[PDB]
Symmetry: C3
Subunit: 333 residues, 3 copies
């Protein structure tokens, strides 16, 4: 088919955990969906101690933004590597077929750009990440990863074939960082990326992250940046981990319908407490809130959550249901 | 509905791996099921070397006891923190909805008690654990976790909708401990919980357990405390891990029907050799024994099993079936 | 039934990643399928640096060869431990029922052999491994493991009950090695297995592999030993990990149908990007190639893949499909 006869629609991306507007049920036929991302190498402070790393980002954020299309749309990405960066980058889409997910076709030095097109033939949430030959884990674990959602053309379905429609969607990217340490255990102070490379490799080879964070930093999805919902709202939380297993859990809630390995032709798992998202995968969980208040959303390795950073909050408004839960006798002597 | 019009039934809990008597198919309408647990801080010897830790327990055991109710029963827990303990505790039920699983409503200082009620709206096996704000992984990884089973009102079903009925049930709680080590590798000798806290945090942050045990100690489910069955018996093994992934395996057997992430509205996985239970989850495996003798039940990271403690035994009585397995030629020169 | 009335067929095994010839759909009734394996202890170089270990193998390879039978065949294995070896060995089949998978019946000292028979009552791919009492993880993590495939008698089926037929099959065994290190981080230089045992145990207890490899060495499934396919070919990749979780991914492709925990009575998961195979399990993924070129097949902990060894290649011949993927604008200033 002549792709030039298809509609083109340009998407304007937004910063995670928010997601660009889209339709769950496709209101048009197949389209070429046009995205642009600009790579930015930048310093990021990732914890409360002030630890600063040299992050590698798509569009200035860790994670990169969530892209949303429908099955059998074409994704057309303009990828820009400005001359203010210093490294070679590319992109691998797990949604795509061929050429190492796109990475063999998208190598851009500083001062270069490229445009890749692929057909999104399989529905699901998928990781995307940089993958420069010989340096792959360093770029990924420096923050250069995000996700793409390929919706079925008739939207999401439950285990019986009935529609599932979310009211709100959030994208939680979880990032394992490997900040090199000296013998005494302090994070090393590097002058350039090349001077950092061997100790970055050493640090990665321990297989022990120093930090595991949501949306790029300890505490990023708390306080004024907590996730929000109301009682009765249907929320989809897309969660990705490009390099290491995670096990999300909504403290005080559930995943009512979960695609733990993210692929919508499969029926969802029901009523999950915790789900395993393997490293290199995106998953999605659908929940209808039933109680107001604060919820924590965590990796349920609780050390990873509360000591290394993999914890966010929901603030949920509405009525308390004392049938579902109540304090019969409040704490007392 | 006025909960005061419902029947009340008091459960008397038992020490894992045994489980309090219950009905698989509910013989009454919904009930308020009353449980009591008393928190006990105590010294426990956890390995053959004599390593002694300061454990934090529900009802004196690691894991805490298995609670069993039916879907849409109400769980009413009296939680007691006697004045002989020194820390603040609470409880989070993954089965419950709201208030951080109950933790926001159940904070008890030494000398206090509380009573929580929640509706068990989802069937499955679920973790429960202590979760005091700011100290969550320390309490969990000190042993303060167990599980609750919410049975469907019409009992368990196979992948085709046919009944599955167990003859025996066991609860295996798997505990990762993080005993702080000095530089030379020996376990440190602490005077109070507050003096221990920073090195406990340091130890946890390595993400490398020093011990991984069933029922609270190396060897706990061996010898005179081996699990038992007879050929032809249907056994359900509930397995929980509140903090870290595990992968159970019955050496010489299978999981004929497994809910690896523990939720009974989902069809079970058939004929599993090994299953992944993510950290923060309870799972359940159903097996009908076909051969007598000794079986080992392990985490099939065999280092975790045989070097760090995550191994128990079954002793199974009955007839040997030489059609299913035989030695044709015994070892010989 | 009198097993002596059944046909006997002798299989001649082949070196992984290749697989002995077999039929997907059984062309005979149940058979006794006769296998022989000879244990070989040997030095193996496992990385590009020249690190040499004392490996323990079935039939001279890491992994041991893939055995293939049909459901309700009998597997009859002659296991030979020649007098040129120095250790006691045995075998545990996860496909088998009873006697610790066979291990209690197959203990062979150097200079001994044995013959075990078992009925393959459950379809799926399964691990087999050595398991000598008290030394289990050392033998497994020295390479003494492989897999067995028990096909349904009417071959593989999709999630709807329709046939799935592969054109090619490969067996990828993934091996975690724990080469002891000195304080400075270099691999130690041992004189005998007994002198090595305590530092092997120490190394294993770190839970941090020094090497994670496919087919026995870094790079083993690259270059002249890359896996091969053509566009349009249906390929089954069987992947096992006897001791530690892995998460396979085909870079530039998918698992169209995946049995992540390897058991064919279950419907496959569709359209997977990455799948979790728990330690102690074999899994299988079915893919139809749609694009030519080089693909990498990896554990998608990318550190494990690209820094520790868990990466292979496919070389795929055929036509490029520019509808599925194209470079619209090649990299340029
Ligand atoms: Cu990059
Ligand atoms: Cu990838
Ligand atoms: Cu506590
Ligand atoms: Cu929890
Ligand atoms: Cu051996
Ligand atoms: Cu095994």
């Amino acid at each position: 088919v002549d792709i030039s006869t298809l509609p083109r629609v340009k998407v304007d991306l937004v910063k995670p955990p928010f997601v660009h507007a889209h339709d769950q049920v496709a209101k048009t036929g197949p389209r070429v969906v046009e995205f642009t991302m600009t790579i930015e190498e930048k310093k990021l402070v990732i914890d409360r101690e002030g630890t600063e790393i040299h992050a590698m980002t798509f569009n200035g954020s860790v994670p990169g933004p969530l892209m949303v299309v429908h099955e059998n749309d074409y994704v057309e990405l303009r990828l820009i590597n400005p001359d203010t960066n210093t490294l070679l980058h590319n992109i691998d889409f797990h949604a795509a077929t061929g050429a190492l997910g796109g990475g063999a076709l998208t190598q851009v030095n500083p001062g270069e750009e490229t445009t890749l097109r692929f057909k999104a033939t399989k529905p699901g949430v998928f990781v995307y990440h940089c993958a420069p030959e010989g340096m792959v884990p360093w770029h990924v674990t420096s923050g250069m990863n995000g996700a793409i959602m390929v919706l079925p053309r008739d939207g999401l379905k439950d285990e019986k074939g009935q529609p599932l429609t979310y009211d709100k969607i959030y994208y939680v990217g979880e990032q394992d960082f490997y900040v090199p340490k000296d013998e005494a255990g302090n994070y090393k102070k590097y002058e350039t990326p090349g001077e950092a490379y061997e100790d970055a490799v050493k640090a990665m080879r321990t297989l022990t992250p120093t930090h595991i964070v949501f949306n790029g930093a300890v505490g990023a999805l708390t306080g004024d940046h907590a996730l929000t919902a109301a009682v009765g709202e249907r929320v989809l939380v897309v969660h990705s981990q490009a390099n290491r297993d995670t096990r999300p859990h909504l403290i005080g809630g559930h995943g009512d319908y979960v695609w733990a390995t993210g692929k919508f032709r499969n029926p969802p798992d029901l009523d999950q407490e915790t789900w395993l998202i393997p490293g290199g995968t995106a998953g999605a969980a659908f929940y209808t809130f039933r109680q107001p208040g604060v919820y924590a959303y965590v990796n349920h390795n609780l050390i990873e959550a509360f000591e290394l950073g993999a914890a966010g909050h929901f603030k949920v408004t509405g009525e308390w249901n004392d049938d579902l839960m109540t304090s019969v006798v409040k704490p007392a002597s």
